Amino acid sequence: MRTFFVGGNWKANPKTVEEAEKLIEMLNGAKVEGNVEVVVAAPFIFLPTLQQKLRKDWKVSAENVFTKPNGAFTGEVTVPMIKSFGIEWTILGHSERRDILKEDDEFLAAKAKFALENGMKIIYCCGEHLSEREAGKASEFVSAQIEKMIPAIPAGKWDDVVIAYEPIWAIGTGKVASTQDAQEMCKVIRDILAAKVGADIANKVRILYGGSVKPNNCNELAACPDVDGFLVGGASLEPGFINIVNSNVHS
Amino acid sequence: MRTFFVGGNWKANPKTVEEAEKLIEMLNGAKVEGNVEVVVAAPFIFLPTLQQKLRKDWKVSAENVFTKPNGAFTGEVTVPMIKSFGIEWTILGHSERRDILKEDDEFLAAKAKFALENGMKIIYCCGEHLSEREAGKASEFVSAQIEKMIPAIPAGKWDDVVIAYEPIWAIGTGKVASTQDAQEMCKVIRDILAAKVGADIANKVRILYGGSVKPNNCNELAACPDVDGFLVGGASLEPGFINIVNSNVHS
Ligand code: NA
Ligand code: NA
């Protein structure tokens, strides 16, 4: 039995440390039902306050890290810096960084390798764009991303890896994803793991749905056999986040 | 008389919050001579501790910011977040971000516009690469960068703008820059400002040397008529930083 996993990705929000602290206080009072692993990802500059104030049964995550321990990389934040605060998680490969910030698969593989080799746990994001979706080539595209990922995972570190599927074809495109879509692609990913690295690893790795998750669809999505949780966007800034965390009882 | 200006760019250093706090304590005990404006730029995740612990007669700076107030930009830090801590400065356009992180001039112009329109002061970086240097086309190249910058500066905000010249042709290239080189390019920049936006603005804007600045060359460089200070790299992590700040007495 894989522990249900819910990551709250604040993205570049909120605007002020005051709003962040109010948000934390909200999360600290939330009543979690069932068995669920909860992680909260926030902007770098809010990480210290999050680590300090967030309920200790949840974990803090970065939204990105660089490839090196330190050095001449103006503007970048590195794994050692994050760890020095006691922070154990980072998101990698989010579609927004792949797209807006031009992060390619080689950059991302290097990050996953460095992060894991340095004691961190990763939420690794993948997902196909509209054209591959419409061509019926989603599985091929996603497979290539996972294959670029796999060689970065050090032996014995798959327990520290969580994979999130983003239906990029449904983000800002005029298309929406169904519950069945989410299940199908999470299954696609799991089968890729089983074929490439073995059933034992495939059965243990949490695969999350990273599309639009809201209180109105989290229960239905949670029930999908291959969906082990969510990487939540907007709802993670709202009270609806606890409903999403509690969707685990339908999984 | 332009106030001498020294920015300490920690870049992606140090590795741990503990090292950062020790570094701050060092800077807090430093005896500054003369008249000099001091700014210290650190990784996002260290900004809160810096803002809190750094001597109040110096100012804290980000090493980068995004183009938007907030939103779906996983991994990015924004102007409002930084300001919510009382932080007033950011570096923009550093060669390492232009090169490694692929930031282009349009991205950078947008950042300068947004930052300044939102109450922040900027250290805007420019500088030509080896090929333009060797072709004797440095001034042409740098002019293009400044021209892309100028339309972003809102009326009445040139007092909030500092420009740093990076001899990228001398960074990781096997070539070294002389004191005369620094002076020549700082002058080039000032003349570009005078021609494009007027002598009054050109006479007020601080132009910094962003090449290799160390205790062994800061006095000589400081004396250069058009060099109003430095954006310091490695030395800003060392005790030699105070020598650099104190070089102002030779300007
Ligand atoms: Na499930
Ligand atoms: Na001078």
Domains in chain B: boundaries: 1-251
B85: alpha, beta or left? (left if phi > 0; alpha if psi -120 to 50): alpha
Of the candidates A25, A193, A7, the residue with the CA atom closest to the CA atom of residue A90: A7
Experimental method: X-ray
* Cα(A42) to centroid(ligand 2), Å: 43
* Phi and psi, residue B156, nearest 5°: 85, 5
Residue among A63, A81, A107, A123 with most chain B CBs within 10 A, to mutate = A81
**A72 within 8 A of B32, measured Cβ to Cβ:** no
Q: Which residues of B are catalytic?
A: 94, 166
CA R_g for chain A: 17
* Cα(A204) to centroid(ligand 1), Å: 13
A129 given a catalytic annotation: no
Token pair for residue B77?
């830090």
Q: Residue B150 burial by CB count (10 A; 0-12/13-18/19+): exposed, middle or buried? A: middle
Cβ contact, residue pair A15, B100, below 8 Å: no
Resolution rounded to one decimal, in angstroms: 2.0
Cβ contact, residue pair B74, A9, below 8 Å: yes
The helix-helix angle for B138-149 and B179-197 (nearest 10°) equals: 50
CB atoms within 10 A of CB B247: 26
Distance, CA of A29 to chain centre: 23
Instruction: Using CB atoms, pick whichever of B74, B84, B97 lies closest to residue A64.
Output: B74
Cβ contact, residue pair B74, A96, below 8 Å: yes
Q: Residue B187 burial by CB count (10 A; 0-12/13-18/19+): exposed, middle or buried? A: middle
**A70 within 8 A of B45, measured Cβ to Cβ:** no
Cβ contact, residue pair A13, B233, below 8 Å: no
Q: How far is B71 from chain A (nearest CA, A)?
A: 5
Listed in sequence order, the residues at least 6 apart from B77 whose beta carbon sits closer than 8 Å to its beta carbon are A12, A43, A44, A45, B44, B62, B64, B65, B66
Token pair for residue B181?
């080189």
Of the candidates A120, A97, A84, A76, the residue with the CA atom closest to the CA atom of residue A11: A97
What is the end-to-end Cα distance of chain B in Å, rounded? 10
In three-state secondary structure terms, A162 is strand
Q: Residue B103 burial by CB count (10 A; 0-12/13-18/19+): exposed, middle or buried? A: buried
Distance, CA of A18 to chain centre: 25
Distance, CA of B116 to chain centre: 15
Token pair for residue B104?
């282009």
**Which residues place a Cβ less than 5 A from the ion ligand 1?**
A 227, 251
Per CB-CB distance under 8 Å, the chain A contacts of B11 are: 71-74
Of the candidates B209, B245, B217, the residue with the CA atom closest to the CA atom of residue B59: B245
Residue in this structure with the two tokens 């321990």, named with its chain if needed: A69
* Cα(A77) to centroid(ligand 1), Å: 34
Given the residues A94, A96, A103, A128, the one annotated as active site = A94
Sign of the alpha-carbon torsion through A98, A99, A103, A104? positive
Strand partners for B207:
B163
**A80 within 8 A of A69, measured Cβ to Cβ:** yes
Residue in this structure with the two tokens 């700076």, named with its chain if needed: B61
Ligand located closest to A226 CA = 1
Given the residues A63, A103, A128, A166, the one annotated as active site = A166
* Phi and psi, residue B232, nearest 5°: -90, 140
The helix-helix angle for A138-149 and A105-117 (nearest 10°) equals: 40
Residue in this structure with the two tokens 């800002």, named with its chain if needed: A172
Token pair for residue B171?
């960074």
* Cα(B94) to centroid(ligand 2), Å: 22
Cβ contact, residue pair A101, B96, below 8 Å: no
Token pair for residue A162?
């969580």
Tell me, which fold does domain A1-251 have in CATH? Answer: TIM Barrel (3.20.20)
Instruction: Using CB atoms, pick whichever of B43, B75, B97 lies closest to residue A81.
Output: B43
In three-state secondary structure terms, B94 is coil
